[PDB]
Symmetry: D2
Subunit: 328 residues, 4 copies
Amino acid sequence: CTGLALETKDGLHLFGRNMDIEYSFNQSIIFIPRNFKCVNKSNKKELTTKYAVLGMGTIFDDYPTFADGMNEKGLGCAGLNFPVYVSYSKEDIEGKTNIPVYNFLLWVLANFSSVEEVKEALKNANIVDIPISENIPNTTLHWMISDITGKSIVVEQTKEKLNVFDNNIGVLTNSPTFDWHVANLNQYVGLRYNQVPEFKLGDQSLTALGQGTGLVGLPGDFTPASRFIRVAFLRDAMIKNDKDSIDLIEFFHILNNVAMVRGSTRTVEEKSDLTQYTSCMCLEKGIYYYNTYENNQINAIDMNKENLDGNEIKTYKYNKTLSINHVN
Amino acid sequence: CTGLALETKDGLHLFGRNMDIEYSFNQSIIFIPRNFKCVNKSNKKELTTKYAVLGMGTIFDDYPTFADGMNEKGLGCAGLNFPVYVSYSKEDIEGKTNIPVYNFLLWVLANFSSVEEVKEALKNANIVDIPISENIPNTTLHWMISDITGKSIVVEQTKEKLNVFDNNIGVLTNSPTFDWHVANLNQYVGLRYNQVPEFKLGDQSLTALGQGTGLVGLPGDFTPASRFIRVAFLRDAMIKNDKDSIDLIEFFHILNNVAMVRGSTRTVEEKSDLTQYTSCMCLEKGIYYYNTYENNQINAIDMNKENLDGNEIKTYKYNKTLSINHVN
Amino acid sequence: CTGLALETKDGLHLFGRNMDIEYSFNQSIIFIPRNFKCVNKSNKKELTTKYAVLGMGTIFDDYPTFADGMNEKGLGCAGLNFPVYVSYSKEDIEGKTNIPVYNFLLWVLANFSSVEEVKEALKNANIVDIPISENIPNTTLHWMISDITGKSIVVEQTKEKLNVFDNNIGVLTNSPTFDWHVANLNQYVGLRYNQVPEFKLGDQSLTALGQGTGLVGLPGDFTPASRFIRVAFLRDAMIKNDKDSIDLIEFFHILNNVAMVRGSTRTVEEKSDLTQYTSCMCLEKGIYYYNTYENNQINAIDMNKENLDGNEIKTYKYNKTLSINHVN
Amino acid sequence: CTGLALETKDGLHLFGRNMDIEYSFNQSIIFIPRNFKCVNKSNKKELTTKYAVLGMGTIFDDYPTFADGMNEKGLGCAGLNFPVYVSYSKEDIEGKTNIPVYNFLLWVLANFSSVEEVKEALKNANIVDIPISENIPNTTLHWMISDITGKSIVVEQTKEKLNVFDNNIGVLTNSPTFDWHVANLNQYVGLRYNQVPEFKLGDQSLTALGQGTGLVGLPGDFTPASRFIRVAFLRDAMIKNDKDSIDLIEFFHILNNVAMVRGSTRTVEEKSDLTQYTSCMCLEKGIYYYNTYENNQINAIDMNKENLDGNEIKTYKYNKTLSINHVN
Ligand SMILES: C[C@H](CCC(=O)O)[C@H]1CC[C@H]2[C@@H]3CC[C@@H]4C[C@H](O)CC[C@]4(C)[C@H]3C[C@H](O)[C@]12C
Ligand SMILES: C[C@H](CCC(=O)O)[C@H]1CC[C@H]2[C@@H]3CC[C@@H]4C[C@H](O)CC[C@]4(C)[C@H]3C[C@H](O)[C@]12C
Ligand SMILES: C[C@H](CCC(=O)O)[C@H]1CC[C@H]2[C@@H]3CC[C@@H]4C[C@H](O)CC[C@]4(C)[C@H]3C[C@H](O)[C@]12C
Ligand SMILES: C[C@H](CCC(=O)O)[C@H]1CC[C@H]2[C@@H]3CC[C@@H]4C[C@H](O)CC[C@]4(C)[C@H]3C[C@H](O)[C@]12C
């Protein structure tokens, strides 16, 4: 997975992600109105939304759980795989705000209006490995949270504590921990976006054979660390050189570079890991944009067109049918 | 630029390219019917089409010139940048079939029905640096040619001779020469598509932190050599592991990985080099599919819907307006 | 700098380092006998040796300070540059065992007989930035400690605490922190020491063009992170495949691979960073072996030949005069 | 193997090589005086030396054959492995100067005084796969030739022709062909010897964590292509920044960086490929310097101390016994 936050030329804030998995999670785009009571049937735990929510998720055992989404106030959150270095408590910890893994994303979006509000609430928080149903293990996760102020944070629970990092990179991938990736960026201080046309090697003249010689050394594989480096620098380059050109499609161009392609990222179970979908939320406007591996046309769902004072969950069908514009 | 040939699950043959440039060439999708006489006004040279042609190009000084295209017989050709190691003759060479640089692509498509036919015609061919108009230098180019048999060739004129390579890789980028890239592939024999989950480093257990550990070492920059390596192995992996899944969208997924992103590939003139468009021709069906940097929705133009016995050139407008599916 | 611990075919334990600096520190090989009182004239602080010590260092303002060394009991310690992430206290911390930066190495060797003894003593230790003389800033350092049991530890003081890591890698370089490097090793689980002779790329046969195709992707620069990776895997490979062949010269072969070469590692002050010397201590035998950038012949100083019950510091001259064996 | 030519601060010319093999070839340092008739017993072919010769080789079936050496006139030649792209004729070609593979090095040194003389003689030359004895296949080889003018050439016979390249890089390794490696250098125009201390990544400050950030992207494995890149740039950096410091030991520092280490370069036959020896010839002085994997002390054999008008081949024993300077 790759998370990305990007400000447009008009001052709007985009936040979204690549979803990198080898399976379907029966996903749909889920809208939840204000004052809606979500009840988990297995453990009787309840959540009533303060703010309306829109995002990608699934309804499991009659309970909504999210992969990424936003609320009506322009707060966004995405859950990304975090298989190594993660540690959840087995049960509730006395004196803490205990949040089940499956419910963390919804807990953020339903309750808070800003990154600053979330940061305060997380000071005494603990993420607990309570199954959504039966005894099913929760997915190993860490979260990126971003809002209309342009501020982003990263939430990672380890065996030590619940870490909340300020994210000045604007990106997130997977393991290792966020501080590891930030330190890893320092190894690439020698990268250059500007073409290096020549090098005088003593008696031999060296000439650039094509565009892009400044970035030689950039890692090209699909590991979380390599993807983190690529997205961090691609984002930086666009902001530095083309701030006044940043719009919706640019978000997708950045994430396309770190997208997994069928056949080349094979799991030990011999399945192809794919970028199943790419989502981009315009936080101010409350519009959820996305495309899929099967259908690259961007689809838009505007939460503000729905009744925020409604009484039911509304779902929209995940679009995996290629949409072609037939010109003639 | 990156050229790609790919066979689908149904046995159809896709051929196309990323167009990587920092400028617009006033491009449109151009259809030329059978028996159409193309006259160059500056040098009075003429070409009358035997076969109908469809592809991306421009009409310069009243004369059509192509970036990539196909004919009605399922022969495809793409012209890609070749700034180093290229050498054209200044004038016609006696006893040779002399083809002006700007006219090579059209010469291939208008006259021949197969790769085998082209190969025979190229034995005594020479590419000459005749300006399309005025004294304007021709773009430095090499060509990939592919047909419905699945065979591909690469055409490169150097100071030595006009080279015609059998292309068993299914890909092409830019400089250096094709044989250089083929030899460069040998450096990556150690790549693996299958996950490497662990490594026992004596007393230290090493564990994969995410998917993709087998491809560590793959180059991630945007130079022609690095892009060649990436597209070659991404293509190979898909054919090996997912032959029965290959369809139209897979072509775009492969090329997306080597697409240039605004801001990060800066020329010495301080302009952003971009993948302006991505084309994919279904050679059997005569359908030209493409999307653009601005609009990622795939557009389709079917040459077989047009009158192949028509009397005029027909053009279709280059689509750079983002097409979004508004769901609600 | 690069630290290395290696067990020989006979069961002896070698420990030593590359010294990577752009300057001379007026170094000599220093022997200190038992019961010798070292007095710092500037701050009146005193240290009386329990065990005899031998290693590379300098006598500054009449006080001995070490770069690397061992004691008579087979305990070894090396101080390596640690410019980022280091944090010393400005003054003594109440209730802690406060050790000045310049004196840490000698404090370890003079007082303790084993890694286990040191580990216990470090639990309540604190490293303080007390100048050796005047107001001169101490070098930013972290330490590797190793003994005749084959156990190694890494000592790093950060803004959080004094960290003592178990070192199961057998190596150390410079910044970032030790846990960062250990996690970085996981990115290279795909490395192979065994030749990969071929790769079938569909219709194209790829053949290894020379030996070493399994390690493609290994970083080749001279940064601390890249050097850590190289030494870790070179060491692992030798132990796995040639345990029964490991002797003195093998230690030097490993470190030669990460040695800096004049001209190519230039500081911002435009000086060449060099591997000034390479030391290798046979811990059981008490022999300090070393060579230098100028003279590659290995020199040996045996501490057990000296009087351990002596009354004076004894120094031996740093050998930087090339020693050639003239055969004819 | 890695060949290197380097000019010293005093204007002397050093030429030599790493010998990278997994076996012993019963090597000794061989001196052949002037006017000495070498007779091959198996094929009755004869060679009488014009100039006296000194270098590493072996006496096989009573016939001397060389790995690397020089003559009394300051001409040097080294034979390096060339397993791919090599092509020898099966028999003598009519009208050509036919030279058996095993005899090429000696043919160069025994007959010619300069690179220019050799270049002229090679115009009509052909290298033939005649066995030294029995039906034993000759080693696949290419050659580097260098003299006291500082000029170097590379000799490679392919299926096309006998190629003689001007070598302006000052280095050679193994396969692919020399022109391939020269073109490969162009991919690294973005390398920098000078430290890059920082990078402003928008809201995140990136800081160099150690020396060497300018060379990130340099390949670190032991393949011929990677070694070629490393030696080319290490040599260039030393000449650019430290021309007035270049002496004998610097030659060894450069080659040490590309030396193979026991255990990590394993052949398909499960043997460790090693840098068995490193030779450095001072061409003006006629001194052959070398060390070995087992003994790193440099040994010197001066051909000018021998009788150049002698009547016998003289050999000196290959030194593989570690020479240590015991100080106390
Ligand atoms: C799809 C996202 C994000 C995962 C990722 O980005 O790696 C994850 C986050 C939480 C995940 C759910 C947690 C509870 C369940 C765990 C089961 O073992 C699989 C189904 C469920 C219902 C999961 C489905 C899906 O796998 C979710 C919604
Ligand atoms: C766009 C393709 C492919 C270029 C590439 O892939 O790099 C190229 C191939 C031939 C090119 C034309 C050749 C003749 C002209 C040369 C002028 O200096 C620029 C305009 C023209 C009319 C060119 C426009 C455009 O640049 C074309 C059509
Ligand atoms: C040489 C080693 C190791 C340094 C390294 O490996 O980077 C270091 C460790 C402690 C260092 C000494 C600390 C105190 C002094 C600090 C001064 O600013 C330079 C001279 C002194 C006397 C230093 C000399 C030298 O620089 C030493 C002995
Ligand atoms: C050692 C050098 C250089 C090889 C290299 O650098 O790879 C080579 C060059 C020519 C080689 C000789 C050629 C003829 C023989 C071929 C046999 O199959 C092995 C023994 C002999 C006598 C070889 C021994 C040795 O292998 C030599 C002397």
